Structures are given as C-alpha cells and as structure tokens.
Amino acid sequence: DEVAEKCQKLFLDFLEEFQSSDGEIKYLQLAEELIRPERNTLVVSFVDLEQFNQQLSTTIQEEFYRVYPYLCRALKTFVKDRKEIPLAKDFYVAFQDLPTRHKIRELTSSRIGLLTRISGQVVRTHPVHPELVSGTFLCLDCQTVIRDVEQQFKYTQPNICRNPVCANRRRFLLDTNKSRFVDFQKVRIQETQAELPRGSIPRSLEVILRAEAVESAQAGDKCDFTGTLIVVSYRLVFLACCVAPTNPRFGGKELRDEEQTAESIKNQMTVKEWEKVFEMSQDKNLYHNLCTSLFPTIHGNDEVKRGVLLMLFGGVPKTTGEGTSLRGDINVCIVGDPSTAKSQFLKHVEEFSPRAVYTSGKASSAAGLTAAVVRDEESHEFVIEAGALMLADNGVCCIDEFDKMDVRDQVAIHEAMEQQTISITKAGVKATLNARTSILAAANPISGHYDRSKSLKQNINLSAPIMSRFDLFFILVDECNEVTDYAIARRIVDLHSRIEESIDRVYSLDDIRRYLLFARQFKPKISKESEDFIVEQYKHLRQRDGSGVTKSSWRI
Amino acid sequence: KTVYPASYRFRQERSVPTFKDGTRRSDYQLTIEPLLEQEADGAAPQLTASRLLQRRQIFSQKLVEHVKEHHKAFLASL
Amino acid sequence: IENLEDLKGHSVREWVSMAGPRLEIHHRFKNFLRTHVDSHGHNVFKERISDMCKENRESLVVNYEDLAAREHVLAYFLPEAPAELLQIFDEAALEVVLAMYPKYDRITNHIHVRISHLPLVEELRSLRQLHLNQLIRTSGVVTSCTGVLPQLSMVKYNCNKCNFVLGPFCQSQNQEVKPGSCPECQSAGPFEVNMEETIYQNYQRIRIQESPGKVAAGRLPRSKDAILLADLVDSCKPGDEIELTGIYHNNYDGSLNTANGFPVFATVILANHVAKKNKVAVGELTDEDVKMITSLSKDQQIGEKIFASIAPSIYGHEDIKRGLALALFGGEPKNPGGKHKVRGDINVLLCGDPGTAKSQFLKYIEKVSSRAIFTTGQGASAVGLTAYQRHPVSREWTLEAGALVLADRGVCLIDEFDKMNDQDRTSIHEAMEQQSISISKAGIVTSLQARCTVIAAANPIGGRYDPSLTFSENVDLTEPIISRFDILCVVRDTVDPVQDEMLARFVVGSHVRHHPSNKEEEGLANGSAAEPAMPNTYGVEPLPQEVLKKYIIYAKERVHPKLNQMDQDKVAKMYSDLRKESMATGSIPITVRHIESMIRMAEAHARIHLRDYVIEDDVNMAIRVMLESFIDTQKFSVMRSMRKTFARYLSFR
C-alpha cells in the first residue's frame, strides 16, 4: 500500500533534520555502535517526534503491526548511507519513551495493532527459547531448495515449489547453518496491588520480548513492558521490546540503583520541588510537625507517631569489607491492645505507602508470602513463585494478630529481620534472593489485656530467639485515669459531627511524598566527635539489662 | 600501543561521564577498535588466517629495530 | 586448492563443500598422524593406535597446540565451522588403523576423533543466537544423569509384496523420516508387529547448571539441556564440576509435527569430547603468586595470620574463629583401614545464645571460598536434600538431585537446624558417613561422590541457653547426630564490665569503614584510606581479599601429608588417665571419636606451614581444641576438676 510507504520516506529525514542538544543528532552516536555485530540499539523517542510531525505519527501508533516490515527496511537503508553494512543480519525497532500508559483492565476487542504501554510487574521467570524467523526448507518431492522462508504467526510452508508441475503438500526439512533464530522469554506478569482500588480479579497476560531484552529479567522486576498486543488456538500475547524498571505506578526515577551528581538532577526535577524542601528543612520542630499532620485521628501517644515516620527511611544497606550486605532497616512492633485501636496504625500506612501488604495470622501459612514452589500444569517443571515479601522491596510489610498462627511460619521468616534475604532451595531448585522489607509486627496478649499479677514475659507468646532478631519493641501505654477517657472522647465527637472538617494539618499529603526521595540522595556521614559518645551509652543499657544479676527480660 | 599505534586503538568515555561502562545488555567495558583497511565486501573489518600472517611481521619489525639499537650500547661498554 | 583465504564470493559452509581444497587438507592431516614431531622428537601418536583397540575405546584425542604450531595458516580455518570437518575426518582415521592393523576390521568402525585443550571458554549465560552451530567449549556442574534408555531407532516390519522387508527406518531424536517420502523409492505395504527384531540405540540426556562460585544473592539460576549420543556414555556423574565440549545446535523433534503448528524450539548441545577436571585447576594458576606466598610463610607467626581476618565485623570470641579456618580445609579423606572406607572431614556444629549474631559468622566464609551454598530449615526437607520422581510428559524416568550432591568438595552452610522436622534429621546420616549415595531406582544403581562439610547453627529450646544443663540435652536434637561432628566450641554471652569497652568501640569503627560513602576515597580512589587496620588481639596484620582466594586453590592441591609413626604411643596411655576419672565427679567418658580425629587437625595445620609430613608441633595444638569443646557440654561446677588437673595439656606452644 502507498500509505505505509509515505510514513517511511518522511521518517528517514527525521534522523537528520531534528537536532538534539547542540548541532548533532542523538542517532549519530548510535550509528557507530550498530557496526559491531552484537548490539542492535534503535531507541526512538516519542516526545521528540511530535515536535516535527503530529499527523504522521498518528498512523504509526494506530496501525503498528502493518508497518512492522516497513520499519526494518527503512532503518537499514538509512544506516547504509552512513556506512556499508553486510547483508546477513536484520534489526528490530526499539520504540520506547511513551508518556501514555494504559491500564490492564482497560481493554476491548480492537486493542491489536495499537502501540501502547502496559504497567504491572512480573513474577514468574522462564528460560530463553528460539523462534524460527528466516528459515530454509527443502522439497522432498523434486529435491529443490527454497530460500527466503519467513514464518509469521503460523506454519508458513511453500504451497507452490519452484517446479510448476508438483509440490510438497506435507512436511519439509529444517535447515542447519541456513536458519536465523531469535530467542525470547515467556514471562508471566501480575497485577500490582497498588493500582486496584475496586474489584479483586487477579489475572495475567502473555508477554514476549526480543533477543537483546534478556538478562535483565528476574523474579521481582516491577518494570512496565512496552509494545503491541498481538492476537494468536486464539489466545493473547503482548509482544514487548525493551524494559525500564522504575518506581511503582509513577513516582520518581532514582532511588537506590543509579547515582549521579547534584547538578544533573536539578535539570530534571521541577521548580516547585526546590523551595518546598529548602525553607522547611531549616526548622527545629520538623520531626514533630510531621507526626500530627499525618495522624489527625490519633490523640496523644507520641511514642507511636515518631517511630512510624522513621520506619519508611531508617538505615541504609551498606557493604562490609568482604562485600556482604548485612542489615539496614529498622523494625518495630506494638503490643497491649486486643486489636481495638492498633488496626488504624496499619491502615494509614497501607493507603499512603504503595509498597505495603496486609494480612492476618491464619491468612498466611508456611509459605505464600516468602517463596512458593509448585509444579506447573502446562509445563510439568518445578518453578519458583515470589511472595509478598519480594514484591514490597525497600518498603514495609504489615501483619496483625500474632497469636492465631503455628510455629512453622515463624521459622521460615527468621531470615527477614536479621539478614533481609530469602534462601529457599527446595527440590534441588536454587532460589536465593534478597528483600529489604521491614516487618511491622503487632503482638497480641494471651488473655487480651495486660495482667498485672503475671510477669511481663508471661503475657506475650514471643520467645527469646524471635525477640533477639527483632529490633525496636514498643508497648502501648495503658492509663486508667479519669483524664484519659475525657480527652480521647472529644476527638471522636469532632470527627463524627464535623465530616471532612476536623483535619487541621499544616502540610498536605502532596508534599510528604515529595520529601521521601530527598532522603535517599545525600548520604550522611559520621562525625569525629561521636565515637566517644556511643561507647559511653551502651554501658548504661548493659547495666539496665541486668536488673537482677545477669539476665532478666529484654536482651540487648 | 605507543610503539605502534597503527593496529589497535582504544576508545572510551572516561573523565567525567561514566568511564565507559554504558550498562547495556551485552557486556560493555573498555572495548577495542582495530585499524584495518576497508575490503571489497563492504562490511566490518573481518580477519582470516592469512591476514595475521604478514600482520605479525609488521608488529615485529618494531622489535628488530630495537634489538639492534640497544646492542650498540652493549658493545660500546666493553 | 593451495590458497584458502580467497573464498571467491563463497561463504564458510561452501568453500569446504566440494573436493577441491580438500585434497591438500586431507593429505596433510593424514601424514601428520603417523609422523608426529613434538618437542624432542618422539612419535607418540603411533603408540596410541594400539592402545585404543585394547578396550575398544574409539576416542582418539589430540592436542590443539600441536596442530596450531605446525600450520600457522590453519589455526583459524578450523574453529570456523567444524561441524562438517570433523565428520569427514572420521573416515580418515579408519584408513590408518586398518592399514597397519588388519585385525581391527572385525570390530565395529566409525571412530569418532576427539579434541582437547581449547583456547576459548564461554560461560553458560552469554550464549544466544550468535553462537548457533558453533563448537564452543562450555563447562558447568552436572545436576543429574540418565542411565540406559531404549531409544526407538530401528523397528522392523514384516512386509510381503516384492520379497523385500521394510527397513531400516529412522525414529531417533536426531533425525526422523516423515510419511510421504519413504527412502525405499517411496514404497509402502502391510505391516506386522514383531517381538525380537528391534535394535535400540543408546541415548542419554544430562542436566547442566551454573557453578555456585559465581552465584550472588539476588539472581535466578538457569538450566541447559545436554544431549549425548553413543560412544561417550556414562562419562560424567551428577554433582561434579567437569568439562564437556559440544556444538550449540538447535533441537529437531519429530513427535509434535503431526498435530501442532510449531515444533519444539530449543537449543541443546551435542557430544564431541569430555574432560573430567580438582587436579587441573592448580596446574593452570599464575606464577607471580607462588613467589610472594613463600616470602611471607618464613615467619613463625603465620598461624594467627588468617585467624584475625575471619569476620572483621564483630570483635571477640577468638576460639570461634579458630574453628572456622580449620574446617575450611576439610582434611584429607584417606583409607586408613583395609576394607572399610573411613571418612575424613572436619564437621563443626555451632550453637550459641540468640543475640550474639551467629549467622553473620557463616556469611564470611562463603564469600572467601570457591564453592559454598546456603539453605534454611523450612525451605527444604527430605525431598530437596540429595536425591528424590519421573518425567510425566511422554512416559519417561529421570532421577533428580538435591543440594549436597552439587556442592562437591566444598563447604555447605545449613541454617535453622534445631527447628528441622524429626523425619528429616534421621535421614541425613547417610550423606555424612560415606560421602556417597546409592540410588536404587528403576533397577539402575549408580554411585557418585559428594564431599561436604556440614556447618549448622542451632538454637536452645524455648528461651535462651542455660549453661547449667548439658549441651546434648539443651538443644532439641537427636543423639546419633551429635556424635558425628568434631568441634563443639560454644560461647555464652553475659554482662561483663571488664570487657564491654571493646565491643562498643569496634562496632563504631567498622560502621564508618564499611560505609558506602567512605568507599569513594578507599575502594574507588586507589592509594588512600581513611582508617587503617583495626587493633587485633595478637598484633598481626589481617588479610584483604585476594589473599584468601589464591590460598585454598594451591595448598590443598599440592603437598599431600602422609602418616608417620612418631610418639603416637604416648596418647594411648594418656587416654587412660581421663577414661578412669571422668565419672569420678560427674561427666561422660571420651569415646573413640577423639582418637581417630587427631589426624584431621594434624594435617590441617601442616598444610598452612607447607609440611610434607606431620610434626609434633601440630598434634599438640590439636588436643587443646578437642578438650575446650568437650568441657562446654557439661556442668560448670565440674570444670574445676578437669581444667586444674589437666592444666599441663591445655598450655602448649
């Protein structure tokens, strides 16, 4: 058709007319790498193509499956003018940088041929498998070799041979050294728990990438694949191209993976995120004003508001001398409430921080949240399935009611608060991963309330090896005075009578999430006047631990 | 490379950017760029078994002129 | 025919297709087989012909350095596409063995030549579609193997139409004959099922896995299908780091081409040559490292040189770090008996009070070694241990392996051992008694070798550890598993104001040294360091990282200490002193385990100082280690009767 040919001649001039930063084109440096036959990078920016033409780029994303062979012959002709290339290796369009994102639940029947982008995250990982693209068959009737055999989505066989007398209406023969294959991966994606406000219908979608899109594809990648949905009996498969592991949903573009200077980050961030974190960081009550502005329904108890804010940040995963990362995250848990008022502490964090889960005691068995293993039904092979602790990486997992549970589940999670890693080798299948997820436990008393007659170790079910690996341990303060119920009752009246009017925060929730990425930028150091202050405070808690003679209650 | 910069020449983006690396998907860390004339096929500078035969003598002649230059100082010292 | 660099528009799989240049290439390799010119001039290839016909071993090996040195213009044309050059070369070997030995024709022919020592080695992760149909040398550890499999390769069918029986046919996994073009001039007739006219062909498949030495925390392992044909059969064992060369060729099925539209798209590797490596890794090391290790070993303080480097993150517990370095060697498992194979591995069982970080002491030895794994208690059981069923896809039987088989001659790390099930602790004794497992499944038995050192970390029952009880009863473990280790050095933490000033001072010094911001001027910027070395308890400088890497791959595979006969009779009468004194206050006597184990630590310390034979200085420092671990398993009140009496034995050097 003449419509597809018009979209290729004008696209060839885009790589020479539209400049980049200076008077050079970003595709000029990419042409020097394509000469070496092991790397085929063809990144095309969509936000820059609309500046030169808009009506031309409309038919590209609307009908992409038909212009698929036209993009391979146009880019190969343009690079031929730069430098002569051999005629024995093809390429692949790597169209990325799409500002428009589509939801998995937003799909109909005409989604094929649309060059869009799908979000989500991948859980299951499959090995590479080749694919017959450019092959060569041989007729077993007249002994003639037929070259240039392209396989689309079915078994494309030559119905008419070279001899116009008879043909082979059965099978052929796969060539050996005259057949080019392209390997791919048949990964299994999964809907993210931070984008499902209503309805709980989990499903997946077939995603197939290209040859150079391997390596960076392991169990625990929250990337968003980009490509075009292809329809197969009759199934669905999303043909991807490149990957880009970023933050869940939207968010920033830098956390604990890429490090740069301070002059290159200012050119990418907005101007509204500069003076907001500049004049407010010089105050003296910055650590206290962020406690009331986030929990307006909680009156009093300043010991639980200053620990939840530090839970998101905390320590950093350092590296020892031999190259082994130890700890680097704070853990806390409360006890002294029969699930009557501590439930709101886990709900405010689940809605705020998207990297958080929520489960009860009986809802989590032995595995499920760590790493589940089960033989596949359509492959018959022992695979490894990620849990809830692997999806909430660099975050915090919530868990309530620590009583209605057995003992086999606590043993399988002992390597989470001390090593922050998962090492499960079951059935000769190695699956050693890592996750920096803090455990936000919530212990519950035996008889519901704290008994004053019994000891402090007889009201809880936690033993010594469990509390030794755990970090901070708080207990809810219980006061039986006439002023406690008189002050908490006034906050309940103002909340149920004045709907959406009792909140009097000084900083909205839009700026709280912005200050989460600035903490992971400039890593603080240790002053030379603090080594003498830490060695003199540990000896105080050493004598505070041994109240009797040697041991007592909490071991420090 | 100093005694003969007419065979292999290195290329990288050190200094301030990223020190080569690149972090691609096919391993990139300090590559090498050969210096070979363009052939009649029209592709990458491909080398065979007969091309490296006389090419080794072009690299070895830098040592022949140095093994006899240093020998002059040994005879003058005796 | 002479010049090969002028292909004249041809490709690699076309210039060597005709018989033009083949005349000179075939005559050159044929005359070179009988006329071997090596270094001094010894024709050894002539004697190899008479050696391969004795045991019917059709595997003629040849060094690659010999063919690359005599013909400098042919060292590149061979690794191009040797898929068809080695097949035609097999016919040349038949014209040599039959020309001088006419009695060899009575046996089967088609001798497959071999090739060893390749100048290129590629890992099992960087191979994609660019290395298709390329003879690449790729190593890797073997996961499991398969025995004899009756592969359907030729089935006879009785026919009656022209007095010609149908056959032979092709039904193997390599190539098949699809209906529609019969090889017998496209003919077909009646069929008849037989019962004794079926000649099967040998066929086995091998699983290839990555080496655990290059596996980090946060990666997923990959598998590889290895298809081995005839000749090379039963040449590899599961759980052994060997080397197998093959061609990276695709898979050609023949069972799904009648119903499915796409065949099995997979990339396997055929069989060409095997190489069982252990002993060849030490012979290919560098030379500048052998000279620098001898200059530092002349001092008499090399014993504490590696003890101060174990776990440089937590200070204290000097007796614990001594047992971790001795268990890394594992001793030398020999055969001291005459018919019984006695194991010789140093097994250390750690168990401390939860709160002193016991698992961090094990994460350091797994990074400074060459092969080490890490598992938990609830993450494995009796299935994922050493061996466990079939392949329910097309009626097949293939056994699998666990984690102790793949960890050959290495150090295994097992976490959470006291919380293990009762049905699992009573099934691990078979692997820690003979270093082998006899799998008796489907009437096929096969023995292998698995050298492992069990290093577990247990916890006391319920709350904390109580020194007032015995170690054999304080931990929820059975009794037959305790009498299988060797070093039982345990520690108990308590409030001590006379030594708490070094704990809080060492954790704050390593907090800044092991900081990512400090590595910019130390690891990133060479020639600068903020903090020097930490003050050890012996005044000996520690070791960085590259010293421990080139330490276990040299001393362990070089000097082999033997068994002499010095003053070993003195220990006989000395053992009777404690045998009739242990029950005099309240303690269990010493069994025979502490007698046969003295040879283990005697050869471990002699390997550090590089001693060809055992010395009296090594057997003395081994008694103080076995006694300090046995006293920690009884009551603290009876310690004044054993330490004060045997004070002359606990004070050597």
CSV table of N, CA and C in Angstrom, one decimal, chain A residues 48-117:
chain,number,residue,atom,x,y,z
A,48,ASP,N,9.8,13.6,21.3
A,48,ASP,CA,10.6,14.4,20.3
A,48,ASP,C,10.1,14.3,18.9
A,49,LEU,N,9.4,13.2,18.6
A,49,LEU,CA,8.9,13.0,17.2
A,49,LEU,C,7.7,13.9,16.9
A,50,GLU,N,6.9,14.2,18.0
A,50,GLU,CA,5.7,15.1,17.8
A,50,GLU,C,6.1,16.5,17.5
A,51,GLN,N,7.3,16.9,17.8
A,51,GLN,CA,7.7,18.3,17.6
A,51,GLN,C,7.9,18.6,16.1
A,52,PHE,N,8.3,17.6,15.3
A,52,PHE,CA,8.5,17.7,13.9
A,52,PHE,C,7.2,17.4,13.1
A,53,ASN,N,6.5,16.4,13.5
A,53,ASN,CA,5.3,15.9,12.8
A,53,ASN,C,4.3,15.3,13.8
A,54,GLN,N,3.0,15.6,13.7
A,54,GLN,CA,2.0,15.1,14.6
A,54,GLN,C,1.0,14.2,13.8
A,55,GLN,N,0.5,14.7,12.7
A,55,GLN,CA,-0.4,13.8,11.9
A,55,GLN,C,0.3,12.6,11.3
A,56,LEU,N,1.6,12.6,11.1
A,56,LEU,CA,2.3,11.5,10.6
A,56,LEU,C,2.5,10.4,11.6
A,57,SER,N,2.7,10.8,12.9
A,57,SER,CA,2.9,9.9,14.0
A,57,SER,C,1.6,9.3,14.5
A,58,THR,N,0.5,9.7,14.0
A,58,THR,CA,-0.8,9.2,14.4
A,58,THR,C,-1.0,7.8,13.8
A,59,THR,N,-0.8,7.6,12.5
A,59,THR,CA,-0.9,6.3,11.9
A,59,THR,C,0.2,5.3,12.3
A,60,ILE,N,1.2,5.8,13.0
A,60,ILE,CA,2.3,4.8,13.4
A,60,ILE,C,1.8,4.0,14.6
A,61,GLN,N,1.3,4.7,15.6
A,61,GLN,CA,0.8,4.0,16.8
A,61,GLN,C,-0.6,3.4,16.6
A,62,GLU,N,-1.4,3.9,15.7
A,62,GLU,CA,-2.7,3.4,15.4
A,62,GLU,C,-2.6,2.0,14.7
A,63,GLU,N,-1.7,1.9,13.7
A,63,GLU,CA,-1.5,0.7,12.9
A,63,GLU,C,0.0,0.4,12.9
A,64,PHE,N,0.4,-0.3,13.9
A,64,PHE,CA,1.8,-0.7,14.0
A,64,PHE,C,2.2,-2.1,13.5
A,65,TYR,N,1.2,-3.0,13.5
A,65,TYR,CA,1.5,-4.3,13.1
A,65,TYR,C,1.7,-4.4,11.6
A,66,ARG,N,1.1,-3.5,10.8
A,66,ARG,CA,1.2,-3.5,9.4
A,66,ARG,C,2.5,-2.8,8.9
A,67,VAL,N,2.9,-1.8,9.7
A,67,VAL,CA,4.2,-1.0,9.3
A,67,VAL,C,5.4,-1.7,10.0
A,68,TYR,N,5.2,-2.9,10.5
A,68,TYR,CA,6.3,-3.6,11.1
A,68,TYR,C,7.4,-4.0,10.1
A,69,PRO,N,7.1,-4.6,8.9
A,69,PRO,CA,8.2,-4.8,8.0
A,69,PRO,C,8.8,-3.6,7.3
A,70,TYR,N,8.0,-2.5,7.3
A,70,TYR,CA,8.5,-1.2,6.7
A,70,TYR,C,9.5,-0.5,7.6
A,71,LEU,N,9.4,-0.7,8.9
A,71,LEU,CA,10.4,0.0,9.8
A,71,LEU,C,11.8,-0.7,9.7
A,72,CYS,N,11.8,-2.0,9.4
A,72,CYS,CA,13.0,-2.8,9.3
A,72,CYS,C,13.8,-2.5,8.0
A,73,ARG,N,13.1,-2.2,6.9
A,73,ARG,CA,13.7,-1.8,5.7
A,73,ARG,C,14.1,-0.3,5.6
A,74,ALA,N,13.5,0.5,6.4
A,74,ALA,CA,13.8,2.0,6.3
A,74,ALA,C,15.0,2.3,7.2
A,75,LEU,N,15.1,1.7,8.4
A,75,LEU,CA,16.2,2.0,9.2
A,75,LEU,C,17.5,1.3,8.7
A,76,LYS,N,17.3,0.2,8.0
A,76,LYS,CA,18.5,-0.5,7.4
A,76,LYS,C,19.0,0.3,6.2
A,77,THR,N,18.1,1.0,5.4
A,77,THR,CA,18.6,1.8,4.3
A,77,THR,C,19.2,3.1,4.8
A,78,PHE,N,18.7,3.7,5.9
A,78,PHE,CA,19.3,4.9,6.4
A,78,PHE,C,20.7,4.7,6.9
A,79,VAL,N,20.9,3.6,7.7
A,79,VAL,CA,22.2,3.3,8.2
A,79,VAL,C,23.2,2.8,7.1
A,80,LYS,N,22.7,2.4,5.9
A,80,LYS,CA,23.5,2.0,4.8
A,80,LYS,C,24.3,3.3,4.3
A,81,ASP,N,23.6,4.4,4.3
A,81,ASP,CA,24.3,5.6,3.8
A,81,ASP,C,25.4,6.1,4.7
A,82,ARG,N,25.2,5.8,6.0
A,82,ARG,CA,26.3,6.2,7.0
A,82,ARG,C,27.5,5.3,6.7
A,83,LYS,N,27.4,4.0,6.7
A,83,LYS,CA,28.5,3.1,6.5
A,83,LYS,C,27.9,1.8,5.9
A,84,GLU,N,28.7,1.2,4.9
A,84,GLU,CA,28.2,0.0,4.3
A,84,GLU,C,28.2,-1.2,5.3
A,85,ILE,N,27.0,-1.9,5.3
A,85,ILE,CA,26.8,-3.0,6.3
A,85,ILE,C,26.6,-4.3,5.5
A,86,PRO,N,27.0,-5.4,6.1
A,86,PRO,CA,26.7,-6.7,5.4
A,86,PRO,C,25.3,-7.0,5.3
A,87,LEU,N,25.0,-7.9,4.3
A,87,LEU,CA,23.6,-8.3,4.1
A,87,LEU,C,23.3,-9.7,4.6
A,88,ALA,N,23.5,-9.8,5.9
A,88,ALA,CA,23.3,-11.1,6.5
A,88,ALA,C,22.8,-11.0,8.0
A,89,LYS,N,22.3,-9.9,8.4
A,89,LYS,CA,21.7,-9.7,9.7
A,89,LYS,C,20.7,-8.6,9.7
A,90,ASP,N,19.5,-8.9,10.3
A,90,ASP,CA,18.5,-7.9,10.4
A,90,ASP,C,18.5,-7.1,11.7
A,91,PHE,N,17.5,-6.2,11.9
A,91,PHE,CA,17.4,-5.4,13.1
A,91,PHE,C,16.1,-5.5,13.7
A,92,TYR,N,15.8,-4.7,14.7
A,92,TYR,CA,14.5,-4.6,15.3
A,92,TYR,C,14.2,-3.3,15.9
A,93,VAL,N,13.1,-2.7,15.7
A,93,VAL,CA,12.7,-1.4,16.1
A,93,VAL,C,12.5,-1.4,17.7
A,94,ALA,N,13.2,-0.5,18.4
A,94,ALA,CA,13.2,-0.4,19.8
A,94,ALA,C,12.5,0.9,20.2
A,95,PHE,N,11.2,1.0,19.9
A,95,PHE,CA,10.5,2.2,20.2
A,95,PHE,C,10.1,2.2,21.7
A,96,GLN,N,10.6,3.2,22.4
A,96,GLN,CA,10.4,3.4,23.8
A,96,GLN,C,10.0,4.8,24.1
A,97,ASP,N,10.0,5.2,25.4
A,97,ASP,CA,9.7,6.5,25.9
A,97,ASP,C,8.3,6.9,25.4
A,98,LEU,N,7.3,6.3,26.1
A,98,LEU,CA,5.9,6.6,25.8
A,98,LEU,C,5.3,7.3,27.0
A,99,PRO,N,4.8,8.6,26.9
A,99,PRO,CA,4.2,9.3,28.0
A,99,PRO,C,2.8,8.8,28.4
A,100,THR,N,2.2,8.0,27.5
A,100,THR,CA,0.8,7.5,27.7
A,100,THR,C,0.9,6.0,28.2
A,101,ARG,N,0.3,5.8,29.4
A,101,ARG,CA,0.2,4.5,30.0
A,101,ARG,C,-1.2,4.0,30.0
A,102,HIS,N,-1.4,2.7,29.7
A,102,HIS,CA,-2.7,2.1,29.7
A,102,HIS,C,-2.9,1.1,30.8
A,103,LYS,N,-4.1,0.9,31.3
A,103,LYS,CA,-4.3,0.0,32.4
A,103,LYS,C,-4.7,-1.4,31.9
A,104,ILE,N,-4.4,-2.4,32.7
A,104,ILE,CA,-4.6,-3.8,32.2
A,104,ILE,C,-6.1,-4.0,32.1
A,105,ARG,N,-6.9,-3.4,33.0
A,105,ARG,CA,-8.4,-3.5,33.0
A,105,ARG,C,-9.0,-2.7,31.8
A,106,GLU,N,-8.3,-1.8,31.2
A,106,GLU,CA,-8.8,-1.0,30.1
A,106,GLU,C,-8.5,-1.6,28.8
A,107,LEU,N,-9.3,-2.6,28.3
A,107,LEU,CA,-9.0,-3.2,27.1
A,107,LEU,C,-10.4,-3.7,26.5
A,108,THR,N,-10.4,-3.7,25.2
A,108,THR,CA,-11.7,-4.2,24.5
A,108,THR,C,-11.3,-5.3,23.5
A,109,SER,N,-11.8,-5.2,22.2
A,109,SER,CA,-11.6,-6.1,21.2
A,109,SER,C,-10.7,-5.6,20.1
A,110,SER,N,-10.5,-4.3,19.9
A,110,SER,CA,-9.7,-3.8,18.9
A,110,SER,C,-8.4,-3.2,19.4
A,111,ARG,N,-7.9,-3.8,20.4
A,111,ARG,CA,-6.6,-3.4,21.0
A,111,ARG,C,-5.4,-3.9,20.2
A,112,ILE,N,-5.6,-4.7,19.2
A,112,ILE,CA,-4.5,-5.2,18.4
A,112,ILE,C,-4.0,-4.1,17.5
A,113,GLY,N,-2.7,-4.1,17.1
A,113,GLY,CA,-2.1,-3.1,16.3
A,113,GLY,C,-1.9,-1.7,16.9
A,114,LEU,N,-2.2,-1.6,18.2
A,114,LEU,CA,-2.0,-0.3,18.9
A,114,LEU,C,-0.7,-0.4,19.7
A,115,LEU,N,0.2,0.6,19.4
A,115,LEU,CA,1.5,0.6,20.0
A,115,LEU,C,1.3,1.4,21.3
A,116,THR,N,1.0,0.7,22.4
A,116,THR,CA,0.8,1.3,23.7
A,116,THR,C,1.8,0.8,24.7
A,117,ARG,N,1.5,1.0,26.0
A,117,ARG,CA,2.4,0.6,27.1
A,117,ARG,C,1.6,0.0,28.2
